[PDB]
Amino acid sequence: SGLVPRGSMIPLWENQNDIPLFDPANPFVPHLVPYILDSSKQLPCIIVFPGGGYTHRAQHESEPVCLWLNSIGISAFVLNYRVQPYKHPAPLLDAKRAIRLVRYFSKKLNIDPNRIGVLGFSAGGHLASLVGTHFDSGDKKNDDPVERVSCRPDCIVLCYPVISLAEFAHEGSKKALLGENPDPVLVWTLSSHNMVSSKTPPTFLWHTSDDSSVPVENSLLFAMALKKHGVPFELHIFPHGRHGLGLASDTLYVKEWTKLCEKWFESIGFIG
What we know:
The protein is of the alpha/beta class and 272 residues long. The chain has helices at 63-71, 90-104, 106-109, 123-131, 171-178, 184-189, 217-228, 257-267, and strands at residues 10-11, 31-35, 43-49, 75-80, 111-121, 156-159, 203-208, 233-238. It has one domain. α7 links the parallel β7 (203-208) and β8 (233-238). InterPro entries: AB_hydrolase_fold, BD-FAE-like_dom, GDXG_lipolytic_enzyme.
């Protein structure tokens, strides 16, 4: 229709001087790309975190995912978070800011502030799992009204996620995010299965069992932690598929994850 924002750049911080840990020598400004649905009712929203090992952001995990989300009634955004040479905690700060921003502007964007979830692939799934475990309900006395808003997502979708930084770690992502001799404390707190709590939102995971880049153990570990803390979850592991299949539209049996995810969204009241 053209009446709603699609394809624009929404900076996470209005003023570049407010970007935490910003390197002005680096031209990249972290931002959201909207793919809003036009509708007369409030819509649920998913922010998509593309993968790319914390060195880039994969495009096949970006706009086409939002087209699928749109097709099932979900307004969507792509989060273009900071990557190498930025390090932790810059990407996580960008992810938390993105959720606060969308929730703050939810009335303007025609989005239900209580149906804002995140969906991440690979290192983007790591980032999604972090904002799904490291969240807070906002700084109510902050001078920035956006900072007063909760950064907790209302649901999490994890697609062949990087989860553990140590055992079964994707070493490329770990090195890009933390450097070569990382603090063991950060290795532990950024292994996101360690940080699941009873307040972690409902989660959907999928993975291929023979993934040779990001071991399927990463999804199994996060699932064990969700159960340990009483969080209901959905998990689908298919036997075969290379890492990074995205929506997997051309992959027999693996392309059945988006239909299962659509039905899970319905099951948790996110759509329908």
